[PDB]
Amino acid sequence: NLTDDRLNHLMNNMPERSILLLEDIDAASVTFSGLLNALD
Amino acid sequence: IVDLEIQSKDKSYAWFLTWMAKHPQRVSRHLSVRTNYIQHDNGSVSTKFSLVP
């Protein structure tokens, strides 16, 4: 159910004083380009 | 004897909301609460709020 827009909103609306964790990033509705743009 | 106006979901909508919020003559009979974290640079961090109408 995850989407690129949902991903961007989640990584932009994280609670403060928090660490993002992506367990097993090698697993890869999200798109490769969308993920790349979201990270950097 | 009186005139009115409507607007919804528009560029001026959020601008309008911000202008109402700052204004000091607000007589807001209904209030809300907006919680946010205030960062005192690297010195310290604390949580505060603002009573949005």
UniProtKB/Swiss-Prot annotation, chain B:
<comment type="function">
    <text>Chaperone necessary for the incorporation of Rieske iron-sulfur protein RIP1 into the mitochondrial respiratory chain complex III.</text>
</comment>
<protein>
    <recommendedName>
        <fullName>Mitochondrial chaperone BCS1</fullName>
    </recommendedName>
</protein>
<comment type="similarity">
    <text>Belongs to the AAA ATPase family. BCS1 subfamily.</text>
</comment>
